[PDB]
A paper describes a structure:
To provide new insight into the glucan metabolism in the Penicillium genus, we focused on two enzymes (named G9376 and [name]) that have been previously identified in the culture filtrate of [name] AQ67100 fed with C. vulgaris biomass. On the other hand, in contrast to its predicted function, [name] acts as a 1,3-β-transglucanase active on 1,3-β-glucan oligomers with a degree of polymerization (DP) higher than 5. Enzymatic analyses revealed that [name] acts as a 1,3-β-transglucanase, rather than a glucanase as inferred by predictions, creating branched-glucans. The antagonizing activity between G9376 and [name] suggests how opportunistic species belonging to Penicillium genus may feed on substrates with a composition similar to their own cell wall without incurring in self-deleterious autohydrolysis.
Moreover, since this region has been predicted to bind a glycosylphosphatidylinositol (GPI) tail for the anchoring of [name] to the cell membrane, we decided to express a truncated variant of the protein encompassing the first 308 residues (hereafter referred to as Δ[name]). The X-ray crystallographic structure of the [name], solved at 1.9 Å of resolution, consists of a (β/α)8 TIM-barrel fold characteristic of all the GH17 family members. The catalytic site is in a V-shaped cleft containing the two conserved catalytic glutamic residues. An important feature of Δ[name] is the absence of the so-called “subdomain” in the proximity of the helix α6, which is present in other glycoside hydrolase of the GH17 family and has been proposed to provide subsites + 3, + 4 and + 5 for substrate binding in 1,3-β-glucanase. Notably, Δ[name] shares this peculiar feature with RmBgt17A, a protein belonging to the GH17 family, which acts as a β-1,3-glucanosyltransferase. Moreover, albeit Δ[name] and RmBgt17A share a low amino acid identity (29%), both the catalytic glutamic residues (E111 and E222) and several aromatic residues pointed out by Qin and colleagues as involved in direct substrate binding in RmBgt17A are conserved or conservatively mutated in Δ[name]. Structural and mutagenesis studies have identified three of these residues (Y102, W157, and E158 in RmBgt17A) as crucial for transglycosylation activity toward hydrolytic activity. In the Δ[name] structure, their topological position is occupied by the residues Y114 (Y102), Y187 (W157), and Q188 (E158) which are likely to fulfill the same proposed role in the stabilization of the transition state at subsite − 1, + 1 and + 2 during the transglycosylation reaction step. In the Δ[name] structure, their topological position is occupied by W161, D162, Q188 and S205 which, together with the structural elements in regions 2 and 3 are likely to create a similar steric hindrance.
Residue numbers in the entry: 0 to 34, 37 to 289
The structure:
């Protein structure tokens, strides 16, 4: 089966922690957009907001909503010990009802991009060197071996330019699949108006595939904002977000594993959410 879902943070746009009831309402609202629906959820961390290493409360919400989970461990900033502890506790506390929903586990999100020259200046925090990322991948594989998650596939999420950076080549060799992050909206060194969005997306995916050594490339993050500042030639608007949804999203949905960015984020700038904060009014026509 092909995964179709959304990316979800551990906090709300204002930075406050999300709890089980918040995740449950999101997962249910995503299902209620199309009656092959959005039934999957990608997370960036195993750790509940406001805690040191308590399992994120998205897990019990997903069990109740039967939501598929693409788990994430955050690998930058030296906190993998707590991520691994939370993963161990999640397996222990929630058992098979949890394991049965897990489609894969991503070790790190954009850690190689933050360890690049332009990524350093993004002020998104520190990154991780390829060798340490490989060691983290091996630690997670050891952690799930023998457990209910022993059949979950291990990947990593990063930008297409970090995948194509040949110094990062050994990371690919330790993964089961590659997670693609790419936004033509942010590619301001190119002619990145909405006019060129599909071309730029397709080109970046083909670049990632060229270094994937025949392993699957999942679309773990892309989207186009409805409001926000102009980036090069790219402008945020409901019309432009709609055009990107139609040109890039509709051909992916149900064909390539895809997690859109994102369901809802009112208050954030740029705002990438496709539904308003009532979790019912779409920002544009979502039919394909
Ligand atoms: C293509 O990809 C490659 C590889 O991914 C990428 O190359 C990296 O480029 C980035 C950006 O320029 C470099 O990051 C800088 O690294 C500076 C040096 O610190 C690093 O190197 C230290 C020494 O490394 C050698 O020695 C040790 C000990 O002998 C050995 O273990 C190593 O393997 C290596 O041989 C190393 O000690 C240091 O470790 C610290 O940081 C890591 C980060 O995860 C963390 O574990 C700890 O905090 C640890 O103390 C680190 O690995 C560094 O000074 C510099 O920091 C600047 O930026 C940050 C913010 O971004 C500021 O906070 C800071 O004040 C500085 O302004 C930055 O981190 C990295 O070294 C390259 N890696 C390699 C392998 O070459 C290319 O850029 C990519 N190409 C393009 C075009 O983007």
């Amino acid at each position: 089966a092909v995964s179709k879902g959304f990316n979800y943070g551990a906090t709300k746009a204002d930075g406050s922690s999300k709890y089980q009831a918040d995740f449950k309402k999101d997962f249910a609202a995503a299902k209620a957009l199309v009656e092959s629906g959005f039934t999957s959820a990608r997370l960036y961390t195993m750790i509940q907001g406001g805690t040191t290493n308590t399992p994120i409360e998205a897990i019990p919400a997903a069990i109740e909503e039967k939501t598929e989970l693409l788990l994430g461990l955050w690998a930058s900033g030296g906190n993998m010990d707590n991520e691994i502890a939370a993963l161990k506790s999640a397996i222990s506390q929630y058992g098979d009802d949890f394991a049965n929903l897990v489609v894969g586990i991503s070790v790190g999100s954009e850690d190689m991009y933050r360890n690049s020259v332009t990524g350093s200046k993004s002020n998104a925090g520190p990154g991780v060197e390829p060798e340490e990322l490989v060691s983290y991948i091996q630690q997670v594989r050891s952690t799930i071996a023998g457990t209910g998650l022993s059949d979950a596939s291990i990947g990593h999420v990063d930008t297409w330019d970090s995948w194509t950076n040949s110094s990062n080549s050994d990371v690919v060799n330790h993964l089961d699949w590659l997670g693609f992050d790419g936004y033509p909206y942010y590619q301001l060194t190119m002619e990145n108006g909405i006019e060129n969005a599909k071309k730029l997306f397709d080109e970046s995916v083909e670049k990632t595939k060229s270094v994937a050594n025949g392993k699957e490339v999942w679309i773990t993050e892309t989207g186009w904002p409805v409001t926000g500042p102009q980036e090069g030639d790219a402008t945020a608007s409901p019309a432009n977000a709609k055009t990107y949804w139609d040109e890039v999203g509709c051909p992916l949905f149900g064909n390539t594993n895809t997690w859109w960015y994102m369901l809802e984020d009112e208050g954030a700038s740029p705002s990438f959410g496709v539904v308003k904060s009532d979790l019912k009014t779409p920002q544009f026509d979502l039919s394909c």
